[PDB]
Design an enzyme around this catalytic site. Sequence first.
Site, PDB file in Angstrom:
ATOM      1  N   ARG A 194       0.868  -1.178   0.000  1.00 51.88           N
ATOM      2  CA  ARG A 194       0.000   0.000   0.000  1.00 51.88           C
ATOM      3  C   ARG A 194       0.891   1.209   0.000  1.00 51.88           C
ATOM      4  NH1 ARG A 194      -2.442   2.075   5.452  1.00 51.88           N
ATOM      5  NH2 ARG A 194      -3.796   3.717   4.695  1.00 51.88           N
ATOM      6  N   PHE A 240       2.328  10.421   1.766  1.00 52.45           N
ATOM      7  CA  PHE A 240       1.872  10.023   3.087  1.00 52.45           C
ATOM      8  C   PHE A 240       2.875   8.982   3.541  1.00 52.45           C
ATOM      9  CE2 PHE A 240      -1.344   7.281   5.411  1.00 52.45           C
ATOM     10  CZ  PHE A 240      -0.947   7.832   6.620  1.00 52.45           C
ATOM     11  N   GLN A 264       3.673   1.292   2.985  1.00 52.24           N
ATOM     12  CA  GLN A 264       3.418   0.284   3.992  1.00 52.24           C
ATOM     13  C   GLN A 264       3.712  -1.091   3.428  1.00 52.24           C
ATOM     14  OE1 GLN A 264      -0.329   0.627   5.915  1.00 52.24           O
ATOM     15  NE2 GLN A 264      -0.365  -1.491   6.584  1.00 52.24           N
ATOM     16  N   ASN A 318      -1.058  -0.947  12.501  1.00 45.41           N
ATOM     17  CA  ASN A 318      -1.803  -1.718  13.468  1.00 45.41           C
ATOM     18  C   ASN A 318      -3.259  -1.700  13.083  1.00 45.41           C
ATOM     19  OD1 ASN A 318      -3.093   0.757  14.725  1.00 45.41           O
ATOM     20  ND2 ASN A 318      -1.217   1.051  15.855  1.00 45.41           N
ATOM     21  N   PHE A 325       5.234   1.177   8.350  1.00 47.83           N
ATOM     22  CA  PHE A 325       5.097   2.090   7.233  1.00 47.83           C
ATOM     23  C   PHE A 325       6.224   3.093   7.349  1.00 47.83           C
ATOM     24  CE2 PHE A 325       3.073   5.856   9.388  1.00 47.83           C
ATOM     25  CZ  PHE A 325       2.509   5.316  10.540  1.00 47.83           C
ATOM     26  N   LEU A 332      -0.876  10.945  13.396  1.00 45.32           N
ATOM     27  CA  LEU A 332      -0.708   9.539  13.716  1.00 45.32           C
ATOM     28  C   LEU A 332      -0.144   9.366  15.096  1.00 45.32           C
ATOM     29  CD1 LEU A 332       0.454   8.241  10.267  1.00 45.32           C
ATOM     30  CD2 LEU A 332      -1.692   8.008  11.349  1.00 45.32           C
ATOM     31  N   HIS A 346       0.355   5.117  16.671  1.00 48.94           N
ATOM     32  CA  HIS A 346       1.189   4.092  16.022  1.00 48.94           C
ATOM     33  C   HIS A 346       2.528   4.240  16.666  1.00 48.94           C
ATOM     34  CE1 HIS A 346      -1.524   3.026  12.901  1.00 48.94           C
ATOM     35  NE2 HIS A 346      -1.921   4.274  12.967  1.00 48.94           N
TER      36      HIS A 346
END
Lengths: 74, 220, 220, 220, 220, 146, 164
Positions: free
Chosen positions: G54, G59, G62, G101, G112, G121, G125
Site C-alpha cells: 500500500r 503520506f 506500507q 496496526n 510504514f 498519527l 502508532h
Amino acid sequence: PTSILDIRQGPKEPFRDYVDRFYKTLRAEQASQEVKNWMTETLLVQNANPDCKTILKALGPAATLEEMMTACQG
Amino acid sequence: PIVQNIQGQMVHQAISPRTLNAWVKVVEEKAFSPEVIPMFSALSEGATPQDLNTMLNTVGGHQAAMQMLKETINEEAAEWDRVHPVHAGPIAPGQMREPRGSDIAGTTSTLQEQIGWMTNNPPIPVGEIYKRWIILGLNKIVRMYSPTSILDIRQGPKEPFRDYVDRFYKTLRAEQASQEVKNWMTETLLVQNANPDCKTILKALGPAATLEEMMTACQG
Amino acid sequence: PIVQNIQGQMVHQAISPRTLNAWVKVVEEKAFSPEVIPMFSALSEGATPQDLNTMLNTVGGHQAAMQMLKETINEEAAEWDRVHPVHAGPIAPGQMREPRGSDIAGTTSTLQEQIGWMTNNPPIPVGEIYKRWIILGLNKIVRMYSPTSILDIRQGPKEPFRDYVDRFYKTLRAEQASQEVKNWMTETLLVQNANPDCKTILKALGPAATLEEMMTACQG
Amino acid sequence: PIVQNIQGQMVHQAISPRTLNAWVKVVEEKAFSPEVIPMFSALSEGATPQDLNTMLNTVGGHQAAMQMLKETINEEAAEWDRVHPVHAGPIAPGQMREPRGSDIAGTTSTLQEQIGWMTNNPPIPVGEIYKRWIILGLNKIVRMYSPTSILDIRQGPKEPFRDYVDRFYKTLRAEQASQEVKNWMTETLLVQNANPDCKTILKALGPAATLEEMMTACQG
Amino acid sequence: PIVQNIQGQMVHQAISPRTLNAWVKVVEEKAFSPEVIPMFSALSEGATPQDLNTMLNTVGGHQAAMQMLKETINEEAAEWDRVHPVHAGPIAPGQMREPRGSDIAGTTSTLQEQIGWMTNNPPIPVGEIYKRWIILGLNKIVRMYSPTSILDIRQGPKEPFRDYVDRFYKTLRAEQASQEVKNWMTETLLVQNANPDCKTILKALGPAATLEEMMTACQG
Amino acid sequence: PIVQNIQGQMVHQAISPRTLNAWVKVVEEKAFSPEVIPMFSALSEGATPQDLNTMLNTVGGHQAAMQMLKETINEEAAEWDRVHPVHAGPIAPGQMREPRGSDIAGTTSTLQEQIGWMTNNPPIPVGEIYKRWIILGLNKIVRMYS
Amino acid sequence: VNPTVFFDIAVDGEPLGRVSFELFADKVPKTAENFRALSTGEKGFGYKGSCFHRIIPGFMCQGGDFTRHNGTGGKSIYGEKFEDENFILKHTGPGILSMANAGPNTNGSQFFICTAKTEWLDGKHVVFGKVKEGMNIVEAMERFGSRNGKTSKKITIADCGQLE
C-alpha cells in the site's frame, strides 16, 4: 531469684501477673538494651498460655505491648 | 527543679528527697487513679528531663505501665524528629544547637544541655514538652486501668443516686473520648441510665438539668 | 423558581404544578422521613420565598409540625433582626433597602422585593436563607418524629446484623448530635450493642473496623 | 444536568423531579440487583456532583449500603489526591487551578464551581469521575447483596436446567471477580454441576458444545 | 552462565546438564539445610537470570517453599522499582539498558537483553541482584524449616555434650538473628541448658571460657 | 581457583562443582582423618579466600569443629592485626592498601581485593596464609578427634 | 548500540536501491527487536521477499505482510500481535518508521515509512526507527503507488538483514 529464661505463665495465671513478673525479672537481669529488644519479641509471646498465645499471635509479631494486653484483657 | 531566685538569676536545684518520697508514696498507695496525673503535674514543676526521668525510674512495679509509657515517649520523639528537621555542622557560639527528639527525651543529653535549652533566649520548653509526653503516657495508662466502660454503667435498685453519679463521673474522668463528645455523654447517659423512679423524676424536671437540682430532686 | 434563560436574563417562572404535586404526594405517602429533607431541597431550587411559602402551605395535616416550623422560622427571623440593624429613611434609587427578618421570611413583602434582592449586584440570596431556616425546622420535626432513641438500640437474638445496622443508621440519620459525636457513636455503639456472637466476631476483627468488613465477618 | 442548546453551548439545568422520582422508585421497588447500575448510569448522564449527592442522599432505607458507598467514595477521593500533587510556581495566564479529592465529590464546593469545571476550556470531567466512583460503589453493594458464592452451586435432582443456569449466571454477573476467570468458570463449573442424566447428555457433546445445544440437549 | 572465553570476550554458554543434575540431587538428598545456600551460590556463579529460573523450576517438591521464594522475589522487585524510579534528569550522553524489577527477575527480559546488561561496559549487576534476592528467599525458607526453636534446645540426662552442642549449634545456625544476639546467646543459653553433671564442669572452668576448653572438659 | 592461562594472564576461574562435591563427599564419608588435611590442601590450590570460605561453609554437620576452626581463624587474624600495623588515609593509585587480618580472612572484603592482592607486584599471597590458618584449625580438630 | 538494518528494494525484479534504518532500541526495545529479527529472518520467518502492498504518495509506504501479502496478515516474533510499547517518539517528518496496526495493542509485522510529516498519527502508532541512508529510494517508490494505496508494479524487499 530466677533467670529470665525460666519465666513461664501458669495455666490460669492471668496475663497481668505474668507480664508483670516477666518485665520485673527482665529489668533485674543485666544485658544490653539491644539484646533485650530481641529477648522480648522472642520470649513474651512464647511463654504465655496457649489460648492467650494464639490470641497474641493473631495480632501479629510486631504488636505493641498495649495491644497485646488489651487482647487478653479479662 | 529550677527555682527562680528572688530578684536574681534562676538557680538549678536537685529534686527534693521529700518530693521524690511523696511521689513514690502516692504511686505505691493509690496505684494509678485519675488524680495521679494532676498530682504528678503538681509535684514536677519546672523540672528538667533528668528530674522527670528520675521521678519515673523511682517508680517500683507496674513495669508493663512503665514500658507503655516509655513506648509512648518513643513514639512522640519519633513524631517530633519526623516533623522537625535537625540541623548540623558548625554552630555559632552562644547559641545551642537544634534539640533532637532523643535529646528532648533526655536519653542522649546531659543536665548542662537541658539547662542551656531552658535558659536560652527565647526559651525552649524542653521540660514542658517532655512533661506533656509523660502526661499523654499516664493518660493511656489510666485509661488501661479503667475497670469498666462508661457505656455499661447501670444504677442498682438500692444503690443511691449519689453513689451512681460518683461512679459515673469517675468513669467519665477515666474515659478517653474528646471533650466535645464528653459533654453529650454526661448530658444524656446520666439521666438515661439511672433507676426508673428518679429517671421519671428527672424527666419531669425536663431540660436544662444540672447536677445540683438533679440531686435535690432525687432526694429520699 | 428562577430559571436562567440560555444566553439571557434569569427570567422568573411560577412553580410548575408538577413540583407541588410531587411535594404533596411525598409528604402524604412518606410522612416525615430523614430523606424528605433532601427531596425538599431538591424540588425547591432557586425558589423565591413566595414559592417556599406556597410549598409549605400546601401541606395537608400534621399541623403541629407546621406550627413548630413556623415557630422556628419566627425565632430565626427574630435572631436575624436582633443581630442585624435595619436602616431607614430615604434610600438611593437603584439600590434596594435593608431586608428585614420578617421580610426575609417573605411574610411582609411581595414577589417584587424578593426578585430584586435575588438580582442585585452583589446578590443577596433570600432563598438560600429561608430554605436554611425551613431545613432547620424540618430537622427539628424529623428529630421529634423519631420513635426510638439512638442509645436504646439492641439487636435481637434472631434478627440478623443487616437489619440491626439498617435500624441503627436510620436512627443515626435521625439523630441531633454534632458530627463528631455522631462519628464517636457510629464507631463505638455499633459493635458495643450487637449480638454476643458477632460481637465477639467484631472484637476479633479488632480496630479499624469498617462496615463492609463487619458485614462480611458476621455472614452466616 | 448540563444540556446543549441550539448554538451548541451548555449551561446548568435544574434536576427534573419524575428523574428523582424514577430513581427512588427503581431503588425501592427493585431494591439492589445487577440491573440498578445501568439504570443509574442512564438516569444521571451529565449530572453534576451536586445532582449525584442528591440522588444518593434521597435513597431512604438500606442505609448500610449507602454508608458502604460513602466509604468507597471516601477512599477513592484520597487515592486521587495522593496520585497527583499540585504544581508550584507561576501559573500560565490562560490556565487556572484544579479541584481536590474531596471537591470531586462536591462536598465542599458550590454548584457554580462545578459548572465552571465542567464547561472549562479544556473541560474537566468531574461528573464522569464521580459517576465512575459511584458505579464502583454500587458494584460493591450488589456484591454484598448477593444471597451465595459461585462454588456452592449444585443443581438439584428436580430443579430444571433452565433455573440452574439462570441462578448460575445471576450469581456470576453478581460476582465480577474478573472477565477471563469468568470465561474459565462458564466452561468448567457450568458442566461440572449438572444432574447425572443430563450431565452425561452434555458430556456426549464434549467440551466444544455451546450453550444453545447444551440446553436443547436437556430440553424435552 | 556467561564465562570468560579466550581471549577476553565473554560469550554465552548454556547451563550444563550436570550442574542441573547436581542441584536436583542436592535438593533431593539434603532437603533444605543451612548449607544449601552456599552450594546454590557456588553452583550458579555468574548465572544469567534465565539459569537461576531454570534451577528454581527444576526443583521437585517443596512447592510451598518455592512459592515463598517467588513472592519474596516479587517483593524485592517491587521495593527495587520503588527505590530505583526514573526521576527527571538531563539525558546521559551514553545510553545503557536498565533492569526493571521484572527485567531483573528474568520474567519479561529476553536472554539477549540480560547478556547485554551483563557484558556491557559498565556492567549492570542483574545476576548478583537476583542472586541476593534468591538468597534472601532461601534464608527465609531455611529459617522456616527449623523444627524446634533455639530456646527449646536442652540436653538429655545421659545425652553426651558432643551431640548436644552439635544440635544446639545446628539449630542456632538455622535460627535468624544479628551477630551480637548470637554472641549473647552462646554465653547465656549454652551453659545453662547443659546437663548438670557437666554443667558443674563448665561452671568450674569460667563464664568467658572458649568452646574447646568446655568440650575437652566434658570430653568423655 | 586461579588458573594460569598458557602464555597469557592468570585468569580467575570459579571453583568447579566437582571440587566441592569431592570435598563434601570426603568430609562426609571419612569424618576427620589425618589424611583429609592433605586432600584438602590438594583440592584447594591457588584458591581465593572466597573459595576457601565456600569450601568450609559447604561442610554439613560437626558444627563444633567448624566453630573451633572459626575461632582459630579469628585468633590468627587478631595476632596478625596486632603484630602488623594497618595504614590508612589516601592511597596512591595502582597500589592496593594494607591487608587487614579480618580482611586477610576474607570476611570483610570482596573477590576483587583478593584478586588484586594475589596479582600485585610483588605478590602478596592471601591464599597461602588463609590456607595455613585453616590447616592449623584442621590440625587442632584432628588432634581433638583422636 | 542501536541496530541498523537494510532493505534492498526491487520493482518487479529490477533492483532499485538500498534503504537502511536505525532502530531506536534504546527507547522502543521490544518493537525494534521484532523489526530487527524479522529483517534477519533468524527466527525462521520474515520480510525478505515480501512487498509494499500500500503506497500513498505524500503520506507513506506500507509493507511487512509476509503471511497474506495484502495488509490482512503478518505476525510478530512474540506471537501474532503485541502491545503498543510506548509513544515516546513522534511522527516528525519523512523517513520515520512507524508500526501499522488495527487499533491499539495489535502490532504484528506491518510497518510504514512516512514520506511526510504525519502528526495526526501520533499517539496511535508506535514510532521505532528512521531511514538512515536511502530516502530518495523511498521517494522514488512513491511513483509506483496511488491515492488509495494500490501499487502499479510489485515492489519487493529483495533482501534485508542487519548491518550493525
